[model samples]
Target: VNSFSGYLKLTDNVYIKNADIVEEAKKVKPTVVVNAANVYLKHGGGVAGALNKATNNAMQVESDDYIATNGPLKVGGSCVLSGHNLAKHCLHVVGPNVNKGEDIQLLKSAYENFNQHEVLLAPLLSAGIFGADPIHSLRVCVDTVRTNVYLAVFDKNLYDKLVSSFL
Candidate 1:
């Protein structure tokens, strides 16, 4: 019944603010949006998939450039996409391949690898298909970044669910 999923305070200048990912994206108007993607960059399901459709499937348009691999997608690895397609830029990060629990280390590595700047937004990695606990993963991200960081929850119901589960 809370509007936000939760919040984590990492530092004075850094903290985890959980709310609607899309709404936060709009508010921050980040130069780049870190998208949870696969090695092939197929934005076909979950938030990435929804973002792909919102951006007119722009990621798939550029998918031909990537290669499928047996391991995890490049960590902190990313390629920029046209702003006309998504945000000013789209930062694709392939989370850990694990399907059970949150990969806190991988999530931290992803944030560390990103050359983030003045305006940036990222999702709680592994929260979707990777099976990471949204709130806990977000806490790791907040603690890892230890700087300007924003964690977004895509759906209001999802936020509610997280809160309910944690509460």
Candidate 2:
């Protein structure tokens, strides 16, 4: 939903139903925000349509400080699933189904309010790299911040991941 009053702007943080995501924006104050919301409404609906509706109303034209949602989307179309890829970072969660919505959830859990300009990272709730074998519930979390690169926070290993990297 994009519009002067209906659509969500690119810079605004959003909250969705059915998914377990923590609002760390107030605490993290991160320059970049991640999207944990899955575009379930687009599989046969509209992602671009949703964005355009808002853009047509004079939404922000900037695209530099956000991350992309996980992929294999079921509802949200590929257009919104993938925008310009213009954001400095890109994290794609596996979808096409709801059961596989763990990766994005993990990203939500990784967020922590450490202080001003800080975001904490941790192994996702039930979607750790090793938690699910074959990564049936895996999604990629990417970051442009060198200090908090997603891969380095933790890789195949779930433990020993750092919060500062994400913070």
Candidate 3:
């Protein structure tokens, strides 16, 4: 009864939480990675194709043959937010690319939502991976209404680099 394919509900999605996304990545069996708006240029997911290709899917708005070699679609002045058009689902939030006030506000909003017990912290941020600094990110993160806040960062390498570069 523990056959891997039949182990989980077909409709049920698995969510693992923590400070490192890569550490939790092994838990995903052919996973689906989702990112939100205002993500950093260095987060390794710059466009719809990178995420889709890594997850074994095609571009969000294109044919199945197109595989991503780089990051998100740098159309206009911004990168693509949600590739829900290609992936299963997406949750987009308006934040800053760096340690701007808007980013803090977004994190505050997310933390408040988590404290309200209305939602879980990890999944919300997972929906919109932070684009900038982790120190600032963590500062806003630790300020959550709950003392035991659960936070998960996607693209652990990117997060680590940011932390390592500054600290």
Top-scoring candidate (lDDT): 1
Model 3 per-residue lDDT tens digits across residues 1-167? 21122121111222223243222222432113234333322333533224444545533433212224444432111222333333232222234434333434555554343343322223224223345445555555454545333334455565455345432
Per-residue alpha-carbon lDDT of candidate 2 for residues 33-144, written as tens digits (9 for 90 to 100): 2332233322111222233233331211322112233333433222222222222222222223336544433432333211111322212322332233313222322221
Order the numbered candidates by TM-score, best leading: 1, 3, 2
Score residue 48 of candidate 3 by CA lDDT. Answer: 28
Candidate 1 per-residue lDDT, tens place, 10-118, comes to 4553444556555555555667777887666777787678777776765667664444323335644556665444467777776665674435577767666454554
State which candidate has the highest TM-score.
Answer: 1
**Comparing 1 and 3 by lDDT, which wins?**
1
Q: Lowest-scoring 10 consecutive residues by lDDT in candidate 3? A: 2-11
Local distance difference test, each candidate: 0.62, 0.26, 0.35
Clashes within 3 Å, all models in order: 0, 12, 6
Runs of candidate 1 with Cα error greater than 4 angstroms are: 1-10, 15-19, 23-28, 66-76, 100-104, 155-167
Error of 1 at 97 (Å): 3.2
Candidates in order, TM-scores: namely: 0.71, 0.24, 0.37
lDDT of 2: 0.26
